[PDB]
């Protein structure tokens, strides 16, 4: 069974949070739940629709901007970069500047598209985890 305060489907538990955080704070907060969780992910359209309906049911059917569990950055060994020979990213000399982009869903009207944003924005978010 999902804990109190979480919405359940067959296999997953979801929970919206109103306390605004940075993307890293939000993800960290999710991972620290009594059952380790993550920022919401969506693996098909119906799940995206469900997640949006849960958010709306919690935010008075209003517009919102919620972190989701994607981030890309181009610096260091957790970057979205890789060498074809499998060596680590230990040195970089990119023309482009070091940057990070965190993803969110922005509900304006209808199912939110997923936009990139400054990771230090303070947004609402949702946690998800899988039942055993």
């Amino acid at each position: 069974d999902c804990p109190d305060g979480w919405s359940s489907t067959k296999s997953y538990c979801y929970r919206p949070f109103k306390e605004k955080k940075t993307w890293e704070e939000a993800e960290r907060f999710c991972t620290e739940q009594e059952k380790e969780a993550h920022l919401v992910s969506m693996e098909n359209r119906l799940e995206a629709v469900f997640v949006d309906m849960v958010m709306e049911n919690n935010f008075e059917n209003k517009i919102y901007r919620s972190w989701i569990g994607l981030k890309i950055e181009n610096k260091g060994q957790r970057s979205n970069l890789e060498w074809s020979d499998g060596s680590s990213i230990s040195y970089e000399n990119l023309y482009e500047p070091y940057m990070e982009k965190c993803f969110l869903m922005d509900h304006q009207s209808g199912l939110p598209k997923w936009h990139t944003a400054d990771c230090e924005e303070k947004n609402v978010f949702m946690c998800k985890f899988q039942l055993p």
């Binding site: 993550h38 969506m42 693996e43 994607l70 970069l81 060498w83 020979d85 060596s87 040195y91 023309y95």
Partner: protein
């Protein structure tokens, strides 16, 4: 341990630029045919970057594929991003090296663009 003729040897690796223009994947596949553990070049330090720049100057304005590419998106829970509702498409790019003020810099490029390329393989 002698690097094959036309390849340039560092302590641990053999390097060679090739002028014939290829997509990123067919360059990578060409490098892997050249030798055990052959790949497009990886650059692991400033000293290797400088050495590679010499390799290029000995051989050749250049634009050449490296082994650096972007990864697929992956959810923080470890799942692959299969389904998306992205506002704008995420399209994995690959990186070429080009001269920038006497050293070189790494630039994003379309993976299907044909470029010269740089191969590396470990000695032994």
């Amino acid at each position: 341990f002698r690097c094959p003729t036309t390849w340039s040897a560092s302590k641990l690796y053999c390097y060679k630029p090739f002028k014939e223009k290829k997509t990123w994947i067919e360059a990578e596949r060409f490098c892997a045919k050249q030798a055990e553990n052959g790949h497009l070049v990886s650059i692991g330090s400033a000293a290797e970057a400088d050495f590679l720049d010499l390799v290029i100057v000995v051989n050749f304005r250049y634009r050449a594929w490296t082994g650096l590419t972007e990864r697929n998106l992956k959810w923080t829970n470890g799942a692959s991003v299969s389904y998306e509702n992205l506002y704008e498409p995420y399209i994995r790019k690959c990186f070429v090296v080009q001269p920038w003020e006497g050293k070189s810099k790494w630039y994003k490029a379309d993976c299907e663009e044909k470029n010269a390329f740089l191969c590396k393989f470990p000695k032994p």
